[PDB]
Amino acid sequence: AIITPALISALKTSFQKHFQDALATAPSTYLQVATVIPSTTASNTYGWLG
Amino acid sequence: QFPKLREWIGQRVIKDMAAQGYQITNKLFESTVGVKRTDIEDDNLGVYGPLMQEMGRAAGAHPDELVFALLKAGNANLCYDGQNFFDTDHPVYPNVDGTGTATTVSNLFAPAADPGAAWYLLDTSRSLKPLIYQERMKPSFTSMTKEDDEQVFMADEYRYGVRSRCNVGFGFWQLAAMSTEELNQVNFEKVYDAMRNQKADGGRPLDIRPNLLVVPTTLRSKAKEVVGVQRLANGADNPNFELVQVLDTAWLN
Amino acid sequence: QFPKLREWIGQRVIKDMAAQGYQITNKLFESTVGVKRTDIEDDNLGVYGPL
Amino acid sequence: RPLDIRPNLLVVPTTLRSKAKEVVGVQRLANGADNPNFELVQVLDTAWLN
Lengths: 50, 253, 51, 50
What we know:
The structure is cut from a larger assembly and holds four copies of chain A. By secondary structure, the first copy, chain A, is low in regular secondary structure. Chain A has one helix at residues 8-11. The longest helix of chain A has 4 residues, at 8-11. Chain A is rod-shaped. The N and C termini of chain A lie far apart (91 Å). Chains in contact: A-B, B-C, B-D. The B-C interface holds B 27-35, 47-48, 51, 54-55, 57-59, 62, 65, 150, 152, 154-155, 157 and C 1-8, 12-17, 19. β1 of chain B pairs antiparallel with β1 (6-7) of chain C. Chain C: This is Bacteriophage Mu GpT domain-containing protein.
């Protein structure tokens, strides 16, 4: 019956992870407005003919 | 959340994470009704012993009362961060955010918008113990011999209402919900866009998708014109038609 | 209806229930028509008869 | 606890029959708008009223 309130009153709990990943983040969208051009050096120079 | 990407200048700034916790304890509940032996045993009409089924349906209806009372009192009870679930001062890293709008002029009934799509819903409930009942219908009972009789019928239940993120929910805008304009569209699209414009700890959008609109029976007509009418008063479209599904409940206000 | 649930603090609070009653008594009505024997018993065209 | 009440019948005399049908019975209000009160309550027209 009688017991310190720092052992039983502390350990009478059940940890659950329902709250984990409850919310999300905005989906990727840069694909719809940009192309992917891989690079192999410090910079990329572009040139086109008129 | 992991710290945001930074431009590499000099050394690195080693940052820290932020773990959060929510604690909530079970509560004890009971409803008990006492009658007399002579009353029931002299009841030849038979309109005095639906007590069993009345008590059963009361036990069944208790969770509705708990959850919707918590929804009502969301402006008073606190969420995990430290403020009220519906408060104007929800804290972000340096910033302050509000999820409750008032007018100080006309604030009568509050509609609620709940993005229930997420894995964790709003105003959750916890069920530690199912319902259990007991009677006093034998001679050997202490109550049966305490007076003429005390034929008590009671319920035992361990429950308590819970809540969740107090930024995914916007459930107090008592300004108005229906008019020719600026109440039908403004104060509803305002809630929708404010919830879709939330910012997480770190500087990332929350990606909120409001889908449920909860209103009392008195504001159902306003809610239905806001969502559920295809045309407009001038013959045009309602841009908010079929935007969110509305639910009418009588457990609030 | 059964009383609502109450938080457990110390002792069970024995509650009371109620029953209601309604009553109404029947009433007697009438409609009466008076006709003359010679008026209808001499009716040869059948004007009277749907009475 | 809340009471479940579901109105389903509107009772009017003959003189108010046109008003009742206009309130419930017409799908377009003024400019092609949609009547929010269309097909929710069935109107009853009886001459035993006023």
